[PDB]
Design a protein around this ligand. Structure first.
Ligand SMILES: C[C@H]1O[C@H](O[C@H]2[C@H](O)[C@@H](O)[C@@H](O[C@H]3[C@H](O)[C@@H](O)[C@@H](O)O[C@@H]3CO)O[C@@H]2CO)[C@H](O)[C@@H](O)[C@@H]1N[C@H]1C=C(CO)[C@@H](O)[C@H](O)[C@H]1O
Ligand SMILES: C[C@H]1O[C@H](O[C@H]2[C@H](O)[C@@H](O)[C@@H](O[C@H]3[C@H](O)[C@@H](O)[C@@H](O)O[C@@H]3CO)O[C@@H]2CO)[C@H](O)[C@@H](O)[C@@H]1N[C@H]1C=C(CO)[C@@H](O)[C@H](O)[C@H]1O
Ligand SMILES: Nc1ncnc2c1ncn2[C@@H]1O[C@H](COP(=O)(O)OP(=O)(O)NP(=O)(O)O)[C@@H](O)[C@H]1O
Ligand SMILES: Nc1ncnc2c1ncn2[C@@H]1O[C@H](COP(=O)(O)OP(=O)(O)NP(=O)(O)O)[C@@H](O)[C@H]1O
Ligand SMILES: [Mn+2]
Ligand SMILES: [Mn+2]
Ligand code: NA
Ligand code: NA
Lengths: 296, 293
């Protein structure tokens, strides 16, 4: 009856423009397809994905009194996602993304959408974790202040560092206080080294470094060699690779909370990620339980 | 009341400031504030003419959009008389990448058109009764309005923007306007395109802007194209979006005031230079005082 998985942060709005190619050669203007601001940033996708897979999720994030804020509220209402909007003077998180015909995405992340005085109230975290098994913390503020509290709780914690430097100190509090750490490998100087470093802090059981259509790589606590997983071919054209890594997290966690072995969890993630690559910005979509369990 | 009737061009730009154009491929950049704003070609011309002290009226189709909200708020805030016609296609919109030098890569939404849309003749006739001039933006249903305008006692201007000089859809605008403005960025043969507007159309003069290099003008009855020089902005160049529209505003302010061609060209250059100094975080147009000295 209560929250099974608490999702912290990551609520926002992407404005997608489909472009002929990336990098886009300079002109005064291109005529593009329909431009339509939608909710569905990393916190929105992890929530939707987990909920579509049948888990009782709660989603909490700071939210502006914005037209962007309206979109996020409507997103959760539309997909039946339990949601708590916290006030903030900074405004709702935004990005402008350029999507190529191959599904590749160039995100322009608004970095002004932070108020240092924002906090996820301790009582709210406590209320939604009273019977919960897992908390996913998005790397958006004020997520950096929540791990003193979560570390004392009988729940597992996961995070997604996305295109982490491997060096940028800001993501460390996330990377070093999470049992399951996810991240992309596109901005890593040394993938293997970053993965080993996250493990050498003595908290994470595994690290996953995703590599798009190549699948990705994983490192398990106490193991020396990194493992790979294969990407799954989508049953539809790759249109928009936005939310794939979030879909991967959702799929993986579904298997994690169901006691599945690592390889199955990785399989779930890959299938969910491939599905997400086939969804336009014109609709919101997350893979369903039945389809996730369909391949062998 | 009204001096100038502005038709079309009501829309919303979403600006993202980027380190360089063209933008090399990365998964993500961290950029400054992204804040959708009203102020496409029609909104800017209206505000420019209004700021300079002319009596304006702006008419365009508008969607029951969040974008529509921004547009309506814009006209109210700046006190621009405005009449929104309903449309099912939605409010026009673009995503613009703006570099540190003010250069802009616009991403125009070409889906915001409904073929059944029309400017109602009775609304057109009503606002052309006392108007001396009508400016028609090249957005639909603009292409259906020149039959009525042709029989009215008003001068007509238009702005063709980054026209091919070949795309047939703009020809109805280019060939039925007293004053034809356009950008020269996409022109293979600037001079030929200008003369073609003179010969096939009824333009009394044609202006092909060229950004910081000024632009080109061709006058009916003359053989050679003239040049005008750009004026340096008096504040840092931030966002060149709206420069061309400001040029039209400054030019018309003098044109409707019977000022010589050289004076009108100069006003536009100043107005356009000023336009490049306004952020996407503010709406701004040059006033009478700053323009006249
Ligand atoms: C979710 C988001 O995470 C990442 O964004 C982080 C930045 O990369 C960090 O640099 C940091 O931003 C700070 C600035 O660096 C700093 O100058 C200051 O302005 O404060 C900023 C915020 O504290 O932290 C950011 C997160 O808070 C990543 O780069 C970004 O791409 C990620 N968003 C993507 C996710 C999805 C779907 O998964 C899309 O909806 C978005 O469009 C993507 O941009
Ligand atoms: C005002 C706008 O004019 C120009 O846009 C025109 C396109 O260039 C044409 O191709 C045509 O678009 C049609 C498509 O070609 C067609 O495939 C179909 O999708 O229908 C479309 C609409 O009929 O007509 C367009 C005008 O509606 C120009 O390219 C564009 O850049 C101009 N907009 C700029 C104006 C300003 C200055 O303030 C900025 O606000 C905008 O961001 C600029 O993009
Ligand atoms: N083009 C593709 N074809 C097939 N599978 C894909 C493709 N792109 C991604 N995937 C799968 O989805 C996973 C996530 O992709 P990836 O691009 O690495 O995530 P991401 O960049 O973090 N997406 P996001 O949630 O928007 O930050 C990969 O590990 C693959 O399993
Ligand atoms: N950087 C600049 N410095 C000085 N004057 C400028 C600058 N950029 C533009 N101008 C002036 O503004 C005029 C119009 O600029 P231009 O870029 O040609 O119009 P535009 O691109 O169509 N703007 P827009 O309304 O967004 O379509 C030029 O002829 C100059 O007089
Ligand atoms: Mn990611
Ligand atoms: Mn223009
Ligand atoms: Na997608
Ligand atoms: Na500007």
């Amino acid at each position: 009856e209560h929250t099974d998985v608490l999702v912290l942060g990551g609520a926002g709005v992407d404005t997608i423009a489909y472009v002929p190619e990336l990098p886009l050669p300079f002109q005064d203007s291109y005529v593009v397809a329909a431009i339509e601001p939608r909710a569905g940033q990393t916190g929105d996708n992890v929530a939707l994905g987990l909920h579509t897979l049948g888990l009782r999720t709660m989603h909490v994030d700071v939210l502006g009194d914005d037209p962007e804020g309206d979109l996020v509220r409507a997103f959760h209402t539309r997909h039946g996602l339990p949601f708590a909007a916290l006030p903030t003077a900074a405004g709702t998180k935004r990005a402008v993304n350029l999507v190529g015909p191959d599904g590749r995405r160039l995100s322009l992340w608004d970095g002004s959408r932070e108020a240092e005085e924002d906090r996820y109230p301790a009582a709210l975290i406590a209320a939604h974790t009273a019977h919960a098994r897992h908390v996913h913390v998005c790397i958006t503020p004020p997520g950096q202040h929540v791990f003193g509290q979560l570390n004392d709780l009988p729940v597992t914690v996961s995070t997604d560092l996305h295109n982490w430097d491997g060096a940028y100190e800001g993501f460390e509090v996330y990377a070093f206080n999470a049992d399951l750490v996810f991240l992309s490998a596109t901005a890593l100087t040394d993938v293997a080294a970053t993965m080993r470093r996250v493990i050498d802090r003595g908290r994470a059981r595994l690290v996953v470094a995703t590599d798009g259509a190549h699948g990705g790589s994983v490192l398990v606590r106490g193991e020396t060699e990194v493992r790979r997983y294969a990407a799954v071919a989508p049953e539809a054209p790759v249109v928009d690779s936005n939310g794939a890594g979030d879909a991967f997290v959702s799929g993986f966690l579904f298997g994690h909370l169901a006691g599945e072995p690592l390889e199955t969890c990785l399989r779930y993630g890959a299938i969910a990620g491939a599905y997400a690559c086939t969804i336009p910005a014109t609709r919101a979509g997350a893979i369903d339980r039945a389809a996730l369990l369909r391949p062998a």
